[PDB]
Design a protein around this nucleic acid. Structure first.
Ligand SMILES: [Zn+2]
Length: 636
RNA sequence: GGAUCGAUCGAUCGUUCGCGAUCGAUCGAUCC
């Protein structure tokens, strides 16, 4: 049974104009979209049929929307199906669209089809319902659909142009500082969705006040540790590793020019990966000791990165998890690495391991952040013993660390590990949500509850304060835009989307000139010859592979831990560099149609030209420019 | 494998305020 709040939300898009309907609850969002769909299909006279498309960006929400739509739009003689990645293989999407009314297709499918050629005009549909439409920022699938829509609208060939009603919960803030910029951002979002009304509950505010789901803020600024003996030991090990790495690279400080570096920080990680990317371009003409020196610096730099991550984990999470993480890394890479460089580094680590284990088991070196975390958890749990809480950490190296700390803490017994009969649900990003804890993690909260923010920096505190200020500013700007009439808003959005179309069509890249030289690829940590670009074939303008049989013996197969097909191939195993001690992540082994193909990634490669002898480095395939010969199945 | 979004950090230019802007790196999440 619809209520007055539903009808007040659904009022402006009822008349036949595009809206930015924003309801916070998910059930309310589903209900307003359902009512809009029902009255859009009911208002059509005989002989004409609607083709409403509902866009869902997530697979579980696609399942949920398809379920509710097929449960409600079932007795009315309406045909409803849906498309996804595991459904759209060799299936005539044109036949579905021409013979369905309430397709609940995901947006990437429509982008792929519009780029392919199928479904040429966007006027086939009549009602586009975007779920969580605030994601339309730049180059998104929603924004690609809107690009094609605006291309169709502003090209002078406007036909039965479908409604593009957007549905959300928060209209979004962007990076606003003052109300003019927030108003400009809201107008830009509205014009990108091409709507002139923003539906928002105003006359039935107590309907939302009945169920609002808003928490209170409970900032707890904490102090870091002071007796950082372990940080001293790991810093000494860092200094030793870097000094012995400097024996083979005299100018190691000069490859990266940023600033002075300090251990246990993200800046050190950036310096580590920059100097990692720096030394894989060496041009020593021996080509045999070049492999060993490149392997040596890769091993040293990967070790330094691992110690830096261990330092970060020890700074944030508890001690023993950081030590066990380092021991696990040394166990997994020791089981693969058997050279004397690994022998030296590993023997240095076990030489320090006795001191590390002695300093790890000291209760006097407990982190105060976890101390007052369990202290606030204990007071609130003694206040309420049926409360399920959710804790957010920034990194996946900490979600298991906090779970281990929960399991190994004897001061608490009511908690259960909830890695995402489950008391506390430890997760990293995203039910009842009766308690939310943000441990050193800055992000979104709007997605008798409480929100305890724990941090060792006041930057997060001032960031959240200006986040509340920008939320208030966005609400005021929304009310100001709702004050306006239909005309001036319409030519304002028309001018700004004309400007957006101008810059979008102006910012077009030409075709890169393909080189006429046969440049080749080499492994990252090994610098051995992998394959020339003349034997590289591109499948669907995104994936690349090698068709030579000499390449087939250059790698080895390792079974994939998480294999899953994506609409074109199916994944069987990863390919690794088959050398003495390389074991580097080259790519992945799939089947496209019948053949087995090892599709590779240029991220873990270094490309050199046979003529000039320079080893340049690329990170993604689009930046790499060469004669992309298409893959022909007639060869092999 | 490929593309996309979000958060942190760093480099470069323009104005000595608050900063604005192209590029880059790490971590997390989604879809194909
Ligand atoms: Zn290799």
């Amino acid at each position: 049974k619809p209520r007055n709040y539903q009808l007040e939300l659904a009022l402006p898009a009822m008349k036949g104009k595009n809206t930015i309907i924003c309801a916070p609850t998910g059930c309310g969002k589903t209900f307003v979209s359902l009512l809009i769909c029902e009255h859009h299909l009911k208002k059509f006279p005989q002989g004409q049929k609607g083709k409403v498309v509902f866009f869902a960006n997530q697979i579980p929400v696609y399942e949920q929307q398809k379920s509710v739509f097929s449960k409600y739009f079932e007795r009315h003689g309406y045909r409803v199906t849906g498309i996804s990645g595991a459904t759209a293989e060799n299936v005539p999407v044109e036949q579905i669209v021409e013979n369905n009314d309430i397709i609940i297709l995901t947006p990437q499918i429509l982008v792929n089809n519009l780029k392919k050629g199928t479904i040429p005009s966007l006027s086939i549909f009549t009602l586009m319902i975007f779920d969580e439409c605030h994601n339309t920022s730049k180059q998104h699938p929603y924004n690609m659909i809107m690009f094609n829509y605006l291309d169709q609208k502003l090209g002078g060939s406007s036909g039965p142009l479908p409604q593009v009603i957007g549905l959300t919960a928060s209209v979004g803030v962007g990076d606003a500082k003052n109300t003019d910029e927030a108003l400009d951002y809201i107008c830009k979002l509205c014009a990108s969705l091409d709507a002139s009304v923003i539906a928002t509950v105003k006359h039935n505010l107590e309907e939302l006040e009945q169920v609002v789901y808003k928490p209170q803020k409970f900032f707890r600024k904490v102090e870091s540790r002071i007796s950082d003996k372990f940080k001293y030991i790991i810093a000494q090990l860092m200094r030793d590793t870097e000094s012995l790495a400097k024996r083979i690279c005299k100018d190691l400080e000069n490859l990266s020019q940023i600033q002075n570096r300090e251990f246990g920080t993200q800046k050190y990680e950036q310096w580590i990966v920059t100097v990692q990317k720096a030394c894989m371009v060496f041009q020593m003409p021996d080509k045999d000791e070049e492999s060993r020196i490149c392997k040596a610096l890769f091993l040293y730099t990967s070790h330094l990165r691992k110690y830096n991550d261990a330092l970060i984990i020890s700074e944030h999470a508890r001690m023993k998890d950081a030590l066990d993480y380092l021991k696990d890394f040394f166990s997994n890479v020791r089981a693969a690495g058997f050279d004397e460089i690994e022998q030296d580094l590993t023997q240095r680590f076990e030489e320090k391991l006795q001191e590390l284990e002695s300093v790890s088991r000291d209760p006097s070196n407990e982190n105060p952040k976890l101390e007052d975390l369990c202290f606030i958890l204990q007071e609130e749990y003694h206040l309420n013993p049926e409360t399920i809480t959710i804790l957010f950490v920034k990194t996946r190296a900490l979600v298991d660390a906090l779970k281990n700390w929960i399991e190994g803490n004897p001061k608490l017994s009511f908690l259960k590990p909830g890695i995402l009969d489950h008391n506390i649900l430890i997760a990293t990003s995203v039910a009842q949500c009766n308690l939310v804890i943000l441990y050193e993690y800055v992000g979104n909260v709007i997605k008798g509850s409480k929100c305890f923010l724990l941090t060792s920096n006041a930057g997060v505190i001032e960031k959240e304060q200006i986040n509340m200020y920008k939320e208030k500013m966005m609400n005021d700007s929304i009310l100001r835009l709702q004050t306006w009439d239909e005309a001036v808003f319409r030519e304002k959005i028309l001018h700004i989307q004309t400007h957006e179309k101008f810059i979008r069509d102006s910012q077009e890249k030409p075709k890169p000139v393909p080189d006429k030289e046969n440049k080749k690829l080499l492994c990252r940590k090994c610098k051995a010859l992998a394959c020339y670009t003349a034997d590289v074939r591109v499948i669907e303008e995104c994936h690349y592979t090698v068709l030579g049989d000499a390449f087939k013996e250059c790698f080895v197969s390792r079974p994939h831990p998480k294999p899953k097909q994506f609409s074109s191939f199916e994944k069987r195993a990863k390919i690794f560099c088959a050398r003495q001690n390389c074991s580097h992540d080259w790519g992945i082994h799939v089947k496209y149609k019948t053949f087995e193909i090892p599709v590779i990634k240029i991220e873990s490669f270094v490309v050199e030209d046979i003529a000039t002898g320079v080893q340049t480095l690329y990170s993604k395939w689009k930046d790499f420019h060469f004669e992309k010969i298409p893959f022909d199945p007639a060869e092999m």
